[PDB]
């Protein structure tokens, strides 16, 4: 669980979770300079999510009592954001694959 975007709006680790996790740096092999098209944020959730569930449904986030009908502008902010990474960052910004 912990805090942050991980396990709150991203994939949530269940309570009393059993299993291993392996993380490794991904400087190359489908990680090039500039902002790649994929690999975007999953934020702006009204709930705290549930263990083991996958959220595939994307929708305009609600920032007010009245919800918009498909127009972007005041409120109705985007719940996603691309990762502005690059293979020329430091140690804390390089892409990392977690399985």
């Amino acid at each position: 669980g912990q805090t942050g975007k991980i396990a709150d709006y991203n994939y949530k680790l269940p309570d009393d979770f059993t299993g291993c996790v392996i993380a490794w740096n991904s400087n190359n092999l489908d990680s090039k300079v500039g902002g790649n098209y994929n690999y975007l944020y999953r934020l702006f959730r009204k709930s705290n999510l549930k263990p083991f569930e996958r959220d595939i449904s994307t929708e305009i986030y609600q920032a007010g009592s009245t919800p918009c009908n498909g127009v972007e502008g005041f409120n109705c902010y985007f719940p996603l954001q691309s990762y502005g990474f690059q293979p020329t960052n430091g140690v804390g910004y390089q892409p990392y694959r977690v399985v």
Partner: antibody
Amino acid sequence: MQLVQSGPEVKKPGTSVKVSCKASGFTFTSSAVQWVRQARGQRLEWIGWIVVGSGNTNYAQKFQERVTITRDMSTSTAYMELSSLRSEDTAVYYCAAPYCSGGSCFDGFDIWGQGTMVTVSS
Amino acid sequence: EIVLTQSPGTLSLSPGERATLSCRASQSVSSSYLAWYQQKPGQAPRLLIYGASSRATGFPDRFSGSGSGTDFTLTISRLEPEDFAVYYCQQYGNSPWTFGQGTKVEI
């Protein structure tokens, strides 16, 4: 409930302007940030809107160039820097953020700052 | 997009006013996306009505108005004398989120 703005700054006419705004009393993760232009004996002009969670901003007919934002997600902040200052850049910028906690919140802008006093001079 | 030019100008009446204000729009704007900020001389502005369909949680009472997209009306029923300041219309939905011209008042 408490939004604070940095002190007024004296700069050079044409280098850059950057004003620090900090918030406390409500969740900054899921909220919005906007910027204002006001002057004595003058009307109000909305500059732009900044989403701290997801980088997205749009400018009016004046701010397409010489303006860029910075997330500054640490310490619950967000910056905007302006370049190529002109003579008529003496204004109070102000800054605000809606009171949001839970996922859905109020529509209007309730918590406001105190602004700065930047006089573009020598 | 900006042709508002709100009808009222400078009002100078004793407390007990029954006048009304109006915000004009170039095109019909969908409801629940309007605002009327209450700016103050030497103080940060506030907000009283949002979307012209409800009120905020806690704010002075005795005034509430609403209107159509072309002409958003608002009425005041004996507001307190200290609330004599500048009102700024504001439209939402379509960027840029431009404000209103502003209105002046007198005791």
